[PDB]
Homo-oligomer: A and B are copies of this chain.
Amino acid sequence: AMGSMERASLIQKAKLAEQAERYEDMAAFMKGAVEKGEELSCEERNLLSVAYKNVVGGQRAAWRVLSSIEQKSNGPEVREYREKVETELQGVCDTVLGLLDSHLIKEAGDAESRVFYLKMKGDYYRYLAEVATGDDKKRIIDSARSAYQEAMDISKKEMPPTNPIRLGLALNFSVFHYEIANSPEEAISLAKTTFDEAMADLHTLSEDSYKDSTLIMQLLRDNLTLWT
């Protein structure tokens, strides 16, 4: 859709859409920027992620409302509308997964970009798994697991334990274990080990890096408190 707009203009419009909380626009602008075929900078990867996370986050919240009504009710309208929302959500996830596969991931060679995209891939398969109920639910779950696992393996080899993307990846993989894979003990173990190894590395950091890392460590702690 965005083929006639300059890459830099798409990026500037994505930033403006973020300021205006127009996340559907911002996702469309960032999709156009990706389709320009150049690799994304650190800032641009964040813009891409923020846009689609907000879009699918609203879809997930609407799906949960409608699923809650549908389970309480158990005419066809509630099922039909939950299905419509569900199809829209799957379409957004498929779009993001298609961008990662064509061709963000294969061109991402530095640890920071490759772990970022693979965490994205695990997340959007996780959102697919949240609504999956048919023949391929197991394959969807394994696709999320495999993406997260590769990202974990890279982040442990290449990143310090306080690196924000390493922390937030481990956070989301722990949520995957707890909510999707029915493995709460793995979820708890991962959140504990992630927190403790980051805590032991905090002394190496500047004031601003310390703030970035401890913020995500708080989220790990919140989950541990909820789960134990």
Contacts and interface: CB of A to CB of B under 8 A. Distances in A.
Contacts of A17: 81
A204 B66 CA distance: 41
Interface string A1-44: 00000000100110011011110000000000000000000000
B81 A13 contact: yes
B65 A9 contact: no
A13 B85 contact: no
A109 interface: no
B77 A20 contact: no
Contacts of A78: 16
A12 B62 contact: no
A13 B21 CA distance: 26
A186 to B, nearest CB: 33
Which secondary structure dominates where chain A touches chain B? helix
Interface residues of A, number: 21
Interface string A73-114: 001011011000100000000000000000000000000000
A65 B17 CA distance: 10
Interface in A155-176: none
A205 interface: no
A10 to B, nearest CB: 9
A69 interface: yes
Given A16-B69, A22-B62, A9 B75 contact: yes
Contact of A21 (B12, B19, B62, B75): B62
Give the residue among A22, A62, A75 with the most B Cβ atoms within 10 A.
Answer: A22
A12 B85 contact: no
B12 A77 contact: yes
B20 A66 contact: yes
A83 to B, nearest CB: 12
Give the residue among A9, A21, A77 with the most B Cβ atoms within 10 A.
Answer: A77
Given A16-B81, A21-B58, 20 more contacts: A9-B75, A9-B77, A12-B75, A13-B80, A13-B81, A16-B66, A16-B69, A16-B77, A16-B78, A17-B81, A19-B65, A19-B66, A19-B69, A20-B62, A20-B85, A21-B61, A21-B62, A21-B65, A22-B62, A22-B85
